[PDB]
Amino acid sequence: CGPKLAACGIVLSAWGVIMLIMLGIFFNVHSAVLIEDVPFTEKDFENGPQNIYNLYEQVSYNCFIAAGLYLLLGGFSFCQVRLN
Amino acid sequence: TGLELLYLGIFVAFWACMIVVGICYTIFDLGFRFDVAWFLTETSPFMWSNLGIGLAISLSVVGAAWGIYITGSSIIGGGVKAPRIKTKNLVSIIFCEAVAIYGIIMAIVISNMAEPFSATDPKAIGHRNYHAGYSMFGAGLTVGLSNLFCGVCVGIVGSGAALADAQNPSLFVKILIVEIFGSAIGLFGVIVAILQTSRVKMG
């Protein structure tokens, strides 16, 4: 590891959680700026907006789970920066 | 230097002139001319074929010939202080000739395929004959150039092996493996050229 990697892991932990929770919010509010980012398909121009809303919820969970993994990288790195 | 520069000048001028023509016939809307279609159709399939056959031999022979003298020169030069070299290290020459063998094999196989059409209209010549002439050219070109490169590599590495033997006999047996990796390239050229040949018929 070394202290350099732990310091990087702290920065990426904080920045990651910030951006990934903000993404989780922008996805959960179904924001229009995310249309080019959501992995929509031809079947989402049928039934109605519930289809895209299901995808926005799943992608909102992706960013929430990734933020959780960056909280774990944080806790690990705050140990390693003291241990190394 | 100078004799290369004269050739380089012709080479650059040739491509510069093609760029001028390519722009010219495009911008003047004459780009309906020089449609690659008529070139690749009014040319006789026999021309493509016979170039193919002759390439298959001659490029293999060039690769093998370089092969030969490159190792041979070293056999001789090391041989002055180490006469033992000549009998065993000569296997490199055998592999260089094997690159020539790969040539003559593929060339003779290709040479069985061609027969007269009794036709001159492209539609009476028909797709099979064009496809054969091209495939035969491709095969003969493939084996020819693959063997060209293969033989030069074998000659180079075999020269190295001969000059290794000149210092220690045991090195030859160990190093000799690289001549196989050289020779294999010529065999791969053969394999592809067989497959390119494998569907052909003429007349």
Binding site: - | L3, Y7, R33, F39, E42, T43, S44, M47, L51
Partner: protein, 39 residues
């Protein structure tokens, strides 16, 4: 007006053999002789 079938086939052959002639002649112009001899 600018080219013909016999011309193209003629040229591909001619330019190919002129390339071989260049290769051959390059090796020939690369011939050399000694300026000294042994004792």
């Amino acid at each position: 007006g600018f080219f013909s079938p016999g011309i193209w086939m003629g040229l591909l052959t001619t330019l190919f053999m002129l390339f071989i002639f260049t290769y051959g002649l390059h090796m020939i112009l690369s011939l050399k002789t000694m300026d000294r001899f042994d004792d």
